[PDB]
Design an enzyme around this catalytic site. Sequence first.
Site, PDB file in Angstrom:
ATOM      1  N   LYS A 154      11.257  -1.023 -29.445  1.00  0.00           N
ATOM      2  CA  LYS A 154      10.980   0.344 -28.969  1.00  0.00           C
ATOM      3  C   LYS A 154      11.927   1.289 -29.780  1.00  0.00           C
ATOM      4  CE  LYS A 154       9.378   3.344 -26.500  1.00  0.00           C
ATOM      5  NZ  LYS A 154       8.200   4.063 -26.971  1.00  0.00           N
TER       6      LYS A 154
ATOM      7  N   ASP B 124      11.519 -11.033 -22.825  1.00  0.00           N
ATOM      8  CA  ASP B 124      11.344 -11.367 -21.417  1.00  0.00           C
ATOM      9  C   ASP B 124      10.040 -10.806 -20.857  1.00  0.00           C
ATOM     10  OD1 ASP B 124      12.758 -10.125 -18.336  1.00  0.00           O
ATOM     11  OD2 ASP B 124      11.912 -12.067 -18.614  1.00  0.00           O
TER      12      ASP B 124
END
Lengths: 414, 414
Positions: free
Chosen positions: B228, B305
Amino acid sequence: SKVVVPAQGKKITLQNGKLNVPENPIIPYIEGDGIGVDVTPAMLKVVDAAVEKAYKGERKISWMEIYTGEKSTQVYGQDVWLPAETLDLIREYRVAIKGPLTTPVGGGIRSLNVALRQELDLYICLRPVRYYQGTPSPVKHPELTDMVIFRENSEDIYAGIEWKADSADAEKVIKFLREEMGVKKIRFPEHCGIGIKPCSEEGTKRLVRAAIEYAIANDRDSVTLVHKGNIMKFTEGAFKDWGYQLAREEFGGELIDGGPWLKVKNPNTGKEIVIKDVIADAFLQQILLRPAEYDVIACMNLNGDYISDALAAQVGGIGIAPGANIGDECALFEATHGTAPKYAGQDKVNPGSIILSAEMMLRHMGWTEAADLIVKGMEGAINAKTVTYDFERLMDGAKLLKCSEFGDAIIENM
Amino acid sequence: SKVVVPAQGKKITLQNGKLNVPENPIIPYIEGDGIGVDVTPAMLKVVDAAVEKAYKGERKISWMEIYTGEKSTQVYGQDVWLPAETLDLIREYRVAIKGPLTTPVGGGIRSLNVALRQELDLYICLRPVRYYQGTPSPVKHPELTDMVIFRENSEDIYAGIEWKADSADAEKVIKFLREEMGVKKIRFPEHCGIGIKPCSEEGTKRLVRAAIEYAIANDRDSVTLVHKGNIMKFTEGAFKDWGYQLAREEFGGELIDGGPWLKVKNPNTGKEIVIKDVIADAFLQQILLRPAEYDVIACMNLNGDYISDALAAQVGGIGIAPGANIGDECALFEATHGTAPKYAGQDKVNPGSIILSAEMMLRHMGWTEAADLIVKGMEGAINAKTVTYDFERLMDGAKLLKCSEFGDAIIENM
């Protein structure tokens, strides 16, 4: 100063927490870069037709163009990506709408979308995602999704507080952390970039308050706080605890069983709203396996960003997803997709995201009838399989329409 | 000291980057809390049957029970959740396998799974997700997913560096940030929890190196760095840049078009591996809309994750997803689901996750034949619709088996 304010038209007013909207309000709109040039004309035309039809000529919007992004540099000069007067005019006229925005790389400029949110303190990023019948979906049961996302917009790792690896600043804060704070947990302190993640009590209680209020006002069935609090106990875990505290303290929430979930009685319908929480990685699994179990979602900046994007992809809405940034003093509605520059000017992308953000703008103005006419047209156009290129590739037997024409198909189904 | 080492059996050895596995190796296993008591017996039985069948009695695993979690407190006393000798014995015997683990709340104990990863420096969390034919899925085309996740395990916001709101520590670091660093970007500095997110050059280049090497060794088609980095330029954005740099510098990557993507020629098959990147919120959309476009994925701790959990839900594998934590000196394979305490002892949960992590353990040992026999049995049992309760609810015409019996169905289909 380069915006020309409409000679007819009156300002919306905030008369303590309530909007006082005139019959001819001036709404600022930022056209947007890239395909903004295609979608924003489609939206001004379907919104005008919807208020013309709903109020039979009594009400009319006076559109006022303001500037941000690439078009601002062509109006004010190559260096001004965000004019100080856009912030002022959105503050002043109270509600605005915008298209997709280009942030430049090379000039140290941080995200212009995030800059509007933070500079105007629009702490709520409200993302409704529901399935529109007949849009092509990747999942077997997209109709089971009807959720509203309350994403915190002013804190988290999105505040942009960070320093480059090997910068003097970075070295200095890593020195502070190891020497003064005694952290022995940074695996490689040399050549290391550092980002700060803040989460406050005021910052999470004002978002959670808005989310439960939304649930009371629309008789939603539950509020789910999603967090990754098993690993981040003092930011994400503090979010879930302050969220439950605010539902106990201000909404008179009561334990279900022996916790952790709460019940809030809706003071208008008598029904019980469940305040529950679920870890953010199991939640990304749960929206796909049990979507009917969830409704109003409250979460922090980053997670909210991931959740909405993921949910908008499963209902087939990556290009028709609406969005709003709401603060106490103004609101900014927006296309939530990108500028898509390859298609810009070609009149072919889906105008559905900014049009459905304009219905959220209308609804927010108290102009419910005009706003129901837009989602009526939307359902009809999509059901008629009279659709834009992105929906027609995935559909059999559809009729391909240009961007502007899907706008007229929304008006025909009104 | 409370572990009893097997009188027959020999230690695996690391003879510079290569495992030297004996015919009767001692493998440490941590049984696990909750349903660990059900799944771990099923896995010791199907792995023994697979090595018995593949090598006709020549090879045999000497299983050695070691302790962590709730069972460690029943063996060493109420206070020891992670014995120092588990870390030593996993270091020593080189490869171990574990079941689900309970971390307690109330005692300031951070995640025991994350504690093993960080204390032994197992910087790779390797998550293979592929579709097993015939498992019930929420998506129309689960067979299109075949990805391998290389998730960085030692840095990111998962390092647990954080301070509570109103703590002296928090006040002190917020003071440092505002006064010494001049940050005017924390919206509410009072009642504010702070988390630190580190990302180093050594930390990302060692994970990316493993991921491209995996792609060369298995002729995968591409490596996608997901990050990101538009909002977190100096951690997540530094990850993508150091990732591309390492593919240029060490693997002789070349620009496709005018970038940003690279091509790496596989020095064994001659084929080109595309090194590409995609923003992490658009990627959560792309795995659902275009899953066949992606293969090997490299990402930071938190994103990795989320990505794996999300991908394991769309292929129907929330309960059959394998996982490994690999370092330079040892590897720990694991059930990636939870302890599920309501079902513990009832012999009904799916043993598929730890069994498929045991095939990854076998494969890693160089015992390929035994490992192919397990995924052969798995495919067969699931295709026979001779399945566990979690798969039978969603399937029509299945035969319901207990946990232990699905283990024998894997051995019957071998």
